[PDB]
């Protein structure tokens, strides 16, 4: 088979600036007779199909800016993406069609580095739906922030928690190239019943401090 | 051109993932309709071809398991992976390949249908609980205020939420489902809106998990 690697796996650039993407082919796609390379490139948000961006090595597709430029020939291609805008962020893949199989590269994930933004934070107790069913679920929200790294640490009647909570992070916002965070603390009705301050602690280096939501069981 | 697909679901080690594809637009007898697939959070995989006059070309990655058909009558065209295991399990896509006129020339893929989850386990199909996260008595010192919706213990994926039969859209965050230790997902869908929308504005989380045949409307009031 033709095998597709891409350079790098991951990376990470600064609005308005330069993106590139390198893609080897094990084997030459270059077509000799028509002088054309039988390479693609497309780009993938979460939960859509690729979307083709460019075919034989350099043409755009439809729909495409000219902000997206590929490049190369024979075995050694590249993905350049200048003035980067928030609603490129994708996973980006090469895709050989020269001969079957058709391969792809590994995909590149493409971060957008934006300016600094604190977190909102938000901290729900668990339903009384749910507790007649014998489980609490207490969520702590960090809504919109940047960058990704972010510390939260639950704390029930001042005892740090460990093991009993799981976060979620959605993929970067296509428009303000923020993310979201949800930690849910899963503790037994008895365990929750148990305790009387509940409280959601988060780090991130847009915040002057560290922010801590909390409630009181039944209040 | 567009592609309609549906099929795969749930379905245990050794059974047969069935799918098919429909096809609108016209010009089905000019192209080798295609499947490619994408296990969650990995890259992409070409199964093979199938055209108009049934010729195939099959990855041998699964050339064995695999069998490709189509009925230009219904301008359809359908897959069959047979003896599945975990490895099966992933986003199946139906693709337009190349036109007859050029082959390989034109060979890029341009159409792509939405995607179709297969997901091969032992597990029950189990529906989720709903429950509201109440905007709390205390709102932000700037006026804004955080509701949601926890999507809990679920199989398989997916579900979709939406808040106001879709009117609501703006500020709103579906995570992505945790897969439990159990085996279950659990999801939370919040959404932030003014303070001062709280009094008159009605909320609602509208869940659907088709696997289960789950649909859910839930209030999400103070
Ligand atoms: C389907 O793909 C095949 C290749 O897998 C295409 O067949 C080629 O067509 C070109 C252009 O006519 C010929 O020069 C090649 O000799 C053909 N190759 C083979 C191996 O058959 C075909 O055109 C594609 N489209 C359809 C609808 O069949
Ligand atoms: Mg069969
Ligand atoms: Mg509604």
């Known amino acids: 088979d033709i095998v597709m690697t891409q350079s790098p796996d991951s990376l990470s650039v600064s609005l308005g600036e330069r993106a590139t993407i390198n893609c080897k082919s094990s084997?030459?796609?270059?077509?000799?007779?028509?002088?054309?390379?039988?390479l693609a490139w497309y780009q993938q948000k979460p939960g859509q199909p690729p979307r083709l961006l460019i075919y034989?090595?350099?043409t755009r597709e439809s729909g495409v800016p000219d902000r997206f430029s590929g490049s190369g020939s024979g075995t050694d291609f590249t993905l350049t993406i200048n003035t980067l805008q928030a609603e490129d962020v994708a996973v980006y893949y090469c895709?050989?069609?020269?001969?079957?199989?058709?391969?792809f590269g590994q995909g590149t994930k493409l971060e957008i580095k934006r300016t600094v933004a604190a977190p909102s934070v938000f901290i729900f107790p668990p339903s009384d739906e749910q507790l007649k069913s014998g489980t609490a679920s207490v969520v702590c929200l960090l809504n919109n922030f940047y960058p990704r790294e972010a510390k939260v640490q639950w704390k029930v009647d001042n005892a740090l928690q460990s093991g009993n909570s799981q976060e979620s992070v959605t993929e970067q916002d296509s428009k303000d190239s923020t993310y979201s965070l949800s930690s849910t603390l899963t503790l037994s009705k008895a365990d929750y019943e148990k305790h009387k301050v509940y409280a959601c602690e988060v780090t991130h280096q847009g915040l002057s401090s560290p922010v801590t939501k909390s409630f009181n069981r039944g209040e | 051109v567009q592609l309609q697909q549906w099929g795969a679901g749930l379905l245990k080690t050794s059974e047969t993932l069935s799918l098919t594809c429909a096809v609108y637009?016209?010009?089905?007898?000019?192209?080798?309709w295609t499947w490619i697939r994408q296990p969650p959070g990995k890259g992409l995989e070409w199964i093979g071809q199938?055209?108009?006059?049934?010729?195939?070309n099959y990855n041998p990655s699964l050339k064995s398991r695999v069998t490709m058909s189509i009925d230009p009558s219904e301008n359809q065209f359908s897959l069959k992976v047979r003896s599945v295991t975990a490895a099966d399990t992933a986003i199946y896509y139906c693709?337009?390949?190349?036109?007859?006129?050029?082959?390989?020339?034109?060979?890029?893929?341009?159409?792509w249908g939405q995607g179709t989850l297969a997901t091969v386990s032992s597990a029950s199909t189990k529906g989720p609980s709903v429950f509201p996260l109440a905007p709390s008595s205390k709102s932000t010192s700037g006026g804004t205020a955080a509701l949601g919706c926890l999507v809990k213990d679920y199989f398989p994926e997916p579900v979709t939420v939406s808040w106001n039969s879709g009117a609501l859209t703006s500020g709103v965050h579906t995570f992505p489902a945790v897969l439990q230790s159990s085996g279950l997902y659990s999801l939370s869908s919040v959404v932030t809106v003014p303070s001062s929308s709280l009094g008159t504005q009605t909320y609602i989380c509208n869940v659907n998990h088709k696997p289960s045949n789950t649909k859910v409307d839930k209030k999400v009031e103070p």
């Open positions: 693709v337009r390949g190349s036109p007859e006129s050029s082959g390989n020339y034109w060979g890029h893929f341009q159409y």
């Open positions: 637009g016209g010009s089905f007898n000019n192209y080798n």
């Open positions: 199938i055209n108009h006059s049934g010729t195939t």
């Open positions: 084997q030459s796609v270059l077509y000799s007779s028509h002088n054309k390379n039988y």
């Open positions: 034989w090595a350099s």
């Open positions: 895709q050989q069609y020269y001969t079957t199989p058709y391969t």
